[PDB]
Design a protein around this nucleic acid. Sequence first.
RNA 1: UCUUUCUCGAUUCCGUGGGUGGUGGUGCAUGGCCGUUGUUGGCUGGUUAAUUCCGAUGAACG
Lengths: 57, 108, 124, 42
Amino acid sequence: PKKNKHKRKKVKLAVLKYYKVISRLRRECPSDECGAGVFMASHFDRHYCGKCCLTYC
Amino acid sequence: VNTALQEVLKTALIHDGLARGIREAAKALDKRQAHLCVLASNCDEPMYVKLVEALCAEHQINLIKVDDNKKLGEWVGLCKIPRKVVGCSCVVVKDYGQAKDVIEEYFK
Amino acid sequence: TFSKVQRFWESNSAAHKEICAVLAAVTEVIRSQGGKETETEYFAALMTTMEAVESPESLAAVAYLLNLVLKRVPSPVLIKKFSDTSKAFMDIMSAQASSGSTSVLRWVLSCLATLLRKQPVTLQ
Amino acid sequence: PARRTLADIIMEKLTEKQTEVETVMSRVLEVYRGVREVLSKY
RNA sequence: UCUUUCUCGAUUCCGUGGGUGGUGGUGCAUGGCCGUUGUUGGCUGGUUAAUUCCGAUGAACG
Ligand SMILES: [Zn+2]
């Protein structure tokens, strides 16, 4: 029962998923500080914001 | 023209404005606060090197082309005194602090 | 000769305790409307605010000056246009009684007492 | 109409004064009421 | 903490050295500082039966 530390999953080229070729594949946050650069998660049942924890279902 | 660019990047590190890295260049450019963009010409993958000029023209941002990235990295402050020499393929200056007038008249 | 309503617009001690604020100088020199005290032409100019405008805290700030100014004896003026004032407020007594506010309501009842103090239709 | 015309001029001057005052100036409580009492004895 | 990847980015994280590493408790001399051995003056706001409740907000004489 040793306390193992979390290791962050090194996703290879995580930058290269929000666009094709032009436009944005993912959603953008409608908040003031978050948005125009802040992408949203696209989960199988929800949308999640990595900055202000905004949740849309 | 590179001599007139070394002064405006140096005062950006003094005022801590510029954003190094591809994603920091991407995040700052579409926030309508970016002022100029620097692109390294030695990019192996062509899918991301052609995105940056599409993004800046959409947000009406001018573009500066530089041949080297490791030389770009050591100029923008990615080296310590240099033992480790690393570079970035893109960097965007957020805000400024003589030749900055020379740089802005070059586009016109 | 305006902007007195916008001086009461801010509710802060930094701009309430000033001499230029409504604490002291409004009670002295604004009664001289145009330099002569006291002209009721201001209250006879804001009917478009007391009619067809129910914006809160704008009718409240005009209610402050309505109570504050009429203390300084426009009594011959009060006699002639008493009916004009009475119809200008008997409809106010019905209007936000249907809405249910207090801040617009408390000073307009005091200025009614102010005009009634200086003075068949009167008992209504 | 003369009284109504002066009313518009009084309203136009007052609205310009409201912008001048702003230029010179230039449900969340109760949920945050709960969390500070949580922080009082956390 | 154990999975599904969402987001911050230099603020970095892995190992090896016989190479350095007091937030100690306790007593004495030690400089400043409190307490210790009279007299006269002087309201934006919401709250309640109620100048009710909460919120901002001085001087000489012996
Ligand atoms: Zn990254």
